[PDB]
Design an enzyme around this catalytic site. Structure first.
Site, PDB file in Angstrom:
ATOM      1  N   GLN D 756       0.851  -1.186   0.000  1.00 52.43           N
ATOM      2  CA  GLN D 756       0.000   0.000   0.000  1.00 52.43           C
ATOM      3  C   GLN D 756       0.887   1.236   0.000  1.00 52.43           C
ATOM      4  OE1 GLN D 756      -2.995  -0.270   3.077  1.00 52.43           O
ATOM      5  NE2 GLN D 756      -4.276  -1.635   1.852  1.00 52.43           N
ATOM      6  N   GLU D 757       1.409   1.539  -1.191  1.00 54.35           N
ATOM      7  CA  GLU D 757       1.938   2.810  -1.689  1.00 54.35           C
ATOM      8  C   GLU D 757       3.285   3.199  -1.108  1.00 54.35           C
ATOM      9  OE1 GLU D 757      -0.943   5.776  -0.970  1.00 54.35           O
ATOM     10  OE2 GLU D 757      -2.593   4.535  -1.680  1.00 54.35           O
ATOM     11  N   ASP D 758       3.720   2.536  -0.045  1.00 55.21           N
ATOM     12  CA  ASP D 758       5.110   2.585   0.387  1.00 55.21           C
ATOM     13  C   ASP D 758       5.525   1.235   0.930  1.00 55.21           C
ATOM     14  OD1 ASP D 758       6.163   5.095  -0.268  1.00 55.21           O
ATOM     15  OD2 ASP D 758       5.152   6.031   1.438  1.00 55.21           O
ATOM     16  N   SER D 759       5.061   0.167   0.309  1.00 55.68           N
ATOM     17  CA  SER D 759       5.370  -1.138   0.843  1.00 55.68           C
ATOM     18  C   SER D 759       5.768  -2.055  -0.294  1.00 55.68           C
ATOM     19  CB  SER D 759       4.207  -1.673   1.671  1.00 55.68           C
ATOM     20  OG  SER D 759       4.026  -0.847   2.806  1.00 55.68           O
TER      21      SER D 759
END
Ligand SMILES: [Zn+2]
Ligand SMILES: [Zn+2]
Lengths: 96, 144, 110, 1009
Positions: D756-759
């Protein structure tokens, strides 16, 4: 435009071309020969040269753009200085 | 050549800049609408813009076409050295590249001058973020 | 307009009228020297400053590598074509010119 | 003779010669090396002899003597000291200092006895590690590893009580010049300023202003006469006007006061301006009166006139513009350079000259370990003299003898240079809220790219935050910290060099061998057309034909006959001056030279550079032959550069044709940690700044002697890899012998959703084969100290010692230390120290409950003679869910879930990517560097050649990366058909795969649990 010009704080720095001081005690023999037409006009039938004009001369020039940009009158400049400082400042308006 | 009438309100200086920042935000956008429309129906940037989940459709118009103008203090790059924004230029350079505008886009790479100018537009906006956390992190804990 | 310095005392001569002659004079203070004033003008106070920049423009700005040399306009009198222009360096986007090829040094304005 | 298109490999030859010779930390090995060479001779030299009072005593020092660093190791026996011994024992790495003393006594009766004290012990200076006085300099490569040292350790850090310190460069404002700034609200209009001082001697500053009052005056005081000029002299709490100062210089007449202010007496526009300032200073004529006027405002105002004749006589020749002259005969000299400031006050008040920017780095002098310790050694050589003033005058009553070898208190120097260089409060320890702290930070050990770019560092003194235009070539624009200081801490570039300092006398002794009548020989009507000539801000002479003086001075730097290479000489034209800087602490960079159309770098040069071995033609014959040239930040204001010699020498439509110089390769403007980014002209500049702060944290093998070291916080990977996609200046940043990460086959896909967008979804059947698996060391200080409650290392039995937890004492040995190879769990006793009282209990637990292995225990003495022990408890750290990863292209990420090779989506050929990053992290973080490195590693693992990602290479665009990929049987945009993980279904779309160099940061998930 009449409404527009009645709000700006217009001093006389905005309309001054340049300013100098001469010493012409005789108006009939000023350092400028060009004004000698109309300087005589205020002195052919002169008013309030009663006892002694101080022998100096403060000569201020005016503009063309900034003087018709606000529809300024040579009277209302001269009348407001005469009303601003009394009759003991012999101010002479001239012609555009 | 003294052949430009100053628009009333500002001098010939400030009306020069407004005249030329007009011709660098239309080409920034005539290269911005013809880039979005030209992308194909299978193009995966278009699936994250048409679907609207990730906004800012100006931030993928810099991938493809033109990065655009740089600014500091709201003005295109001021003369630092002495009337020369970098030591590669002549004096009297009000031109469309010696004050910041970028012809290139990130896919094609950036000229080594224009890499410095985008390092300056990215510094004015990199600080304000460090300022606008001590501004709106303080209104909200005061207005409570 | 400029300053008239005092003779053999070397200070500044104040202007002072003489009412007994109705004739302007200059005068010192630390001595008693005076001078027949031949100017009749104390000072001028220019607001426009419509200044000819060409008095300030130096002919030595011709051997500077950082200026836009062009060959579009020849010299005003020397017929030489290397005209290197520049800004005013001061309300105006005026360009002034300086001819190259020294012992010329002439300047003009377009 | 001339290289047309062979320029690319050409320019990377002349740089290879550069970082061979200078390297990366020579800026502290020139500067600190020059401080111990003469700037510890000069302070001993200039300080006046103690002339203390019948008898009289005279005390005059002589030449001073150093050594190599040495420990007087408490047994009455001396012993030399080496840096890997001084870290382990908390020593201070310093060398003793020895002076010769002359000593005359006068004994009433016209014959005097003189004595001498040859080489008397006075104190110690902390030697900077590896600079000409250390024991390391003088040792070759193999001889250096027989002492457990590192051949790649850069040096430039002195050990203080065990730990490592670095004097950061504290940036200040340049002295001895005339600054005409402007102010907004204050009671002035166009004020000036100068901050004179000579040679960095005593009398630190005297910030004399000269300031023009406004025209907003009331009444006929100013408004009916106009704007006046004042002079805020030091040690006068008033605004002593101008003409009063010149009449205190022995002048009378108002031509011989305006013959030092205005040069042409034929221009009415300037003569109007000074006219209302003569009117205020008008009644005073005699120098006995103006000097009464000036002295009547002093520190304590004297009562007699003879005080105010005495006081302001030494004000105006000892503490006002010292650098123009400090003698009692410089009245004629000071009369010009004070009058010169008023001439630069009028040139901005009229709008006839641009006023000075405050940011511009031509006005900025940097300081390094050399000048800063000179500021700290003057304030402590006087204190040595001060107690000798005290000890002797308490002995005049006896007059028996005198003895200096008991009188020199050696612990004055060997503490204040060790206190103020430990803590950072840069000054003495008696007035602490008056210093400039933050100097002498503590040194990073994470990456070895951090250890470099912790040493090439400036520091603003607090608009100092935006990016100024005079940082082309000097300072890195990308690298800066984030948070509470953006732009206030700036790190240097690669081709930046800071001048060291030199003596200005062999340029003044050249100018008079050519031309230039001095100030004593000017009729100042002959100064309206001359080009005024400056040296170090001092003003000596004029000249009539500056074109020949320009060429004659340039051809002495290009041959290094008389003027050194360090000095830069600057001619402005429209202001009609020549400046010459022999100044210590500037910054300058080397450029190539153009000769009227083309270079002076010719083919016969670089064919001799190419065989650098066995010809020793290494950059010190290329400077001397006049091909390169050091150019500072303020001659760049006078210069014309070209970017590239290819396109900017070939005539096209004639943009410009007067090129004076060219630069080596325009990617040398990036600093240490901003050179590691592949394609940094493809990144949105918030992400080159972002990476240039994450490069410090990403762990890797830091120094190749971590077997010997005892650091806290020592992270080291198992299997570091040099990157497949690289820059041609990694080689010089030393990033092949010491890398910082492992590559990883990375796919850009949405999947089960743990990205989710930084993972990032890892691969647990790749983590099993050591992928990012790293060790984390640890250390423990344990000072035994006998005092009298004293304590000794021992083993506490439970029912004879006081308060302790249920930490079982199995692991402790016969004496209270754990032998290495004993697995310690969470919270069990490692050192069983007992304050003897029955006895109290002072165990030192394993913090954080990590459950590692005790790896090494050393037992030494302290500085004093007390037994010591350090302990290094190591632990592995497998990458769990949580541990934070980041590429070289911004976009720091976590670790969501660890799938299996079983489950990770396989290609057509059995490849299952190590890491899946989210698609949505691309178009708004905006790094298209990440989609090209991921493309370049797929070419360069099939072309078999480690790729090219120099910044402005102009030969690697993404078209011919594609068509080299298409010659192996892939799809030329890098796409590739993955299959599903669970079902085996072909995915409806493709996936973009390719190896990309990932870094495991130190923001771990086991640092907090
Ligand atoms: Zn006089
Ligand atoms: Zn000509």
């Amino acid at each position: 435009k009449d409404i527009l010009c009645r709000l700006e704080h217009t001093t006389l720095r905005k309309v001054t071309a340049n300013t100098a001081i001469y010493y012409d005690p005789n108006p009939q023999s000023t350092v400028v020969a060009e004004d000698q037409e109309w300087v005589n006009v205020y002195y052919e039938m002169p008013d309030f040269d009663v006892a002694r004009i101080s022998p100096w001369l403060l000569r201020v020039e005016l503009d063309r753009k900034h003087m018709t940009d606000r529809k300024l009158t040579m009277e209302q400049i001269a009348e407001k200085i005469n009303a601003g400082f009394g009759d003991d400042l012999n101010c002479i308006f001239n012609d555009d | 050549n003294n052949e430009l009438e100053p628009t009333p309100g500002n001098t010939l200086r400030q009306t020069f800049e407004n005249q030329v920042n007009r011709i660098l935000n239309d080409a920034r956008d005539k290269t911005g609408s013809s880039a979005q429309k030209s992308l194909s129906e299978y193009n995966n940037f278009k699936s994250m813009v048409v679907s609207g989940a990730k906004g800012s459709k100006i931030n993928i118009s810099q991938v493809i076409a033109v990065v655009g103008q740089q600014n500091v203090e709201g003005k295109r790059i001021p003369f630092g050295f002495k009337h020369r924004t970098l030591p590669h230029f002549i004096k009297d350079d009000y031109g469309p590249e010696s004050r910041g505008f970028v012809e290139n886009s990130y896919l094609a790479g950036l000229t080594p001058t224009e890499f410095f100018f985008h390092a300056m537009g990215g510094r004015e906006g990199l600080i304000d973020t460090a300022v606008k956390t001590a501004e709106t992190g303080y209104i909200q804990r005061r207005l409570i | 307009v400029g300053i008239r310095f005092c003779q053999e005392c070397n200070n500044m001569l104040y202007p002072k009228e003489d009412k007994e002659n109705r004739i302007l004079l200059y005068a010192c203070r630390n001595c008693d020297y005076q001078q027949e004033a031949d100017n009749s003008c104390i000072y001028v106070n220019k607001i426009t400053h419509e200044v000819d920049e060409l008095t300030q423009i130096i002919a030595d700005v011709s051997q500077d590598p950082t200026l836009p040399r062009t060959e579009d306009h020849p010299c005003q009198k020397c017929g030489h074509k290397e005209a290197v222009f520049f800004q005013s360096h001061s309300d105006a986007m005026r360009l002034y010119y300086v001819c190259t090829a020294p012992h010329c040094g002439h300047r003009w304005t377009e | 003779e001339i290289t047309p298109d062979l320029w690319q490999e050409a320019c990377w030859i002349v740089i290879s010669s550069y970082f061979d010779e200078k390297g990366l930390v020579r800026q502290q090995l020139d500067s600190f090396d020059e401080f111990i060479q003469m700037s510890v001779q000069r302070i001993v030299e200039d300080a006046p002899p103690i002339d203390l009072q019948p008898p009289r005593y005279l005390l005059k020092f002589e030449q001073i003597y150093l050594s190599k660093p040495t420990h007087w190791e408490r047994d009455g026996a001396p012993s030399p000291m080496m840096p890997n011994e001084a870290r382990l024992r908390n020593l201070t790495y310093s060398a003793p200092l020895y002076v010769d003393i002359t000593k005359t006594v006068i004994k009433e009766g016209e014959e005097q006895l003189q004595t001498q004290h040859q080489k008397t012990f006075i104190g110690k200076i902390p030697i900077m590690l590896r600079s000409t006085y250390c024991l390391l300099n003088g040792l070759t490569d193999r001889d250096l590893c027989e002492l457990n040292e590192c051949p790649l350790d850069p040096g430039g850090y002195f050990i203080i009580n065990g730990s490592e310190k670095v004097l950061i460069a504290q940036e200040k404002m340049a002295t001895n010049t005339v600054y005409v700034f402007a102010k907004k609200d204050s009671k002035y209009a166009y004020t000036g300023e100068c901050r004179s001082c000579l040679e960095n001697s005593s009398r630190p500053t005297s910030t004399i202003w000269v300031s023009m009052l406004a025209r907003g005056g009331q009444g006929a005081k100013k408004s009916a006469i106009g704007q006046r000029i004042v002079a805020t002299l030091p040690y006068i709490k008033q605004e002593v006007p101008i003409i009063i100062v010149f009449r205190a210089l022995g002048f009378v007449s108002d031509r011989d006061i305006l013959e030092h202010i205005i040069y042409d007496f034929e221009d009415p526009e300037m003569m109007e301006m000074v006219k209302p300032s003569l009117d205020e200073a008008f009644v005073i004529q005699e120098q006995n009166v103006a000097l009464n006027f000036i002295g009547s405002r002093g520190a304590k105002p004297g009562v007699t006139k003879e005080k105010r004749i005495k006081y302001a006589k030494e004000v105006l020749q000892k503490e006002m513009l010292p650098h123009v002259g400090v003698s009692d005969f410089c009245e004629t000299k000071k009369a010009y350079f004070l009058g010169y400031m008023v001439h630069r006050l009028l040139l901005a008040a009229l709008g006839r000259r641009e006023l000075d920017d405050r940011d511009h780095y031509g006005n900025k002098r940097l300081d390094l370990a050399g000048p800063l310790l000179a500021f700290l050694f003057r304030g402590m050589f006087k204190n040595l003299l001060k107690e000798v003033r005290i000890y002797a005058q308490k002995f005049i009553d006896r007059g028996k003898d005198f003895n200096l070898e008991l009188a020199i208190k050696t612990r004055i120097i060997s503490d204040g240079l060790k206190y103020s260089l430990a803590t950072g409060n840069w000054g003495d320890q008696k007035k602490a809220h008056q210093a400039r702290a933050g100097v002498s930070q503590v040194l990073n050990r994470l990456t070895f790219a951090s250890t470099l770019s912790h040493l090439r560092r400036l520091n603003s003194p607090i608009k100092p935050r935006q990016l100024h235009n005079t940082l082309w070539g000097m300072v890195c624009p990308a690298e800066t910290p984030e948070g509470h200081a953006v732009g206030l801490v700036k790190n240097l570039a690669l081709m930046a060099y800071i001048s060291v300092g030199s003596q200005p006398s062999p340029i003044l002794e050249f100018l008079e061998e050519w031309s230039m009548e001095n100030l004593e020989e000017i009729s100042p009507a002959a100064i309206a057309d001359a080009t005024k000539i400056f040296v170090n801000g001092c003003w000596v002479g004029i000249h009539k034909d500056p074109e020949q003086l320009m060429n004659t001075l340039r051809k002495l730097r290009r041959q290094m006959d008389i003027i050194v290479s360090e000095v830069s000489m600057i001619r402005d034209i429209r202001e009609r001056e020549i400046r010459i800087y022999t100044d210590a602490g500037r910054i300058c960079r080397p450029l190539l030279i153009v000769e009227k159309q083309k270079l002076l770098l010719k083919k016969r040069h670089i064919d001799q550079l190419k065989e650098r071995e066995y010809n020793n033609y290494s950059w010190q014959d290329l400077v001397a032959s006049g091909v390169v040239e050091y150019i500072d930040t303020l001659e760049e204001e006078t210069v014309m550069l070209a970017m590239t010699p290819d396109d900017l020498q070939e005539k096209e439509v004639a943009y410009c044709s007067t090129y004076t110089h060219c630069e080596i390769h325009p990617s040398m403007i990036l600093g240490v940690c901003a050179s590691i980014i592949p394609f940094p002209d493809h990144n949105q500049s918030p992400r080159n700044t972002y990476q240039s702060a994450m490069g410090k944290q990403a762990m890797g093998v830091y120094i190749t002697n971590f077997h010997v070291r005892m650091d806290t916080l020592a992270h080291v990977l198992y299997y570091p890899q040099k990157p497949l996609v690289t820059t041609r200046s990694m080689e010089y940043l030393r990033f092949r012998e010491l890398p910082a990460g492992i590559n990883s086959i990375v796919a850009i896909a949405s999947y089960t959703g743990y990205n989710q967008e930084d993972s990032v979804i890892m691969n647990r059947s790749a983590v099993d084969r050591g992928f990012f698996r790293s060790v984390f060391y640890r250390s423990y200080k344990e000072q035994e100290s006998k005092k009298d409650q004293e304590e000794v290392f021992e083993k506490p039995t439970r029912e004879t010692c006081q308060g302790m937890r249920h930490a079982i004492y199995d692991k402790l040995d016969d004496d209270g230390l754990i032998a290495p190879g004993v697995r310690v769990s969470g919270d069990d006793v490692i050192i069983g120290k007992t304050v003897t009282l029955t006895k109290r209990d002072c165990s030192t637990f394993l913090r954080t409950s990590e459950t590692g292995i005790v790896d090494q225990v050393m037992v030494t003495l302290n500085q004093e003679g007390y037994k010591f022990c350090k302990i290094r408890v190591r632990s592995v750290r497998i990458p769990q869910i949580g541990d934070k990863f980041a590429s070289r292209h911004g976009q720091k990420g976590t670790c969501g879930i660890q799938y299996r090779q079983e489950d990770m989506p396989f290609t057509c050929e059995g490849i299952t990517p190590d890491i899946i990053i989210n698609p949505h992290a691309i178009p708004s973080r905006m790094t298209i560097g990440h989609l090209i490195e991921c493309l370049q590693g797929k070419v360069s693992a099939n072309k078999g050649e480690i790729g090219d990602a120099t910044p402005f290479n102009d030969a690697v665009n993404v078209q011919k990366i594609s068509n080299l990929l298409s010659d192996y049987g892939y799809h030329l945009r890098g796409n590739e058909v993955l299959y599903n993980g669970f079902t085996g279904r072909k995915i409806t779309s493709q996936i973009f795969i390719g190896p990309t160099y990932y870094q495991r940061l130190k923001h771990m998930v086991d640092d907090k649990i």
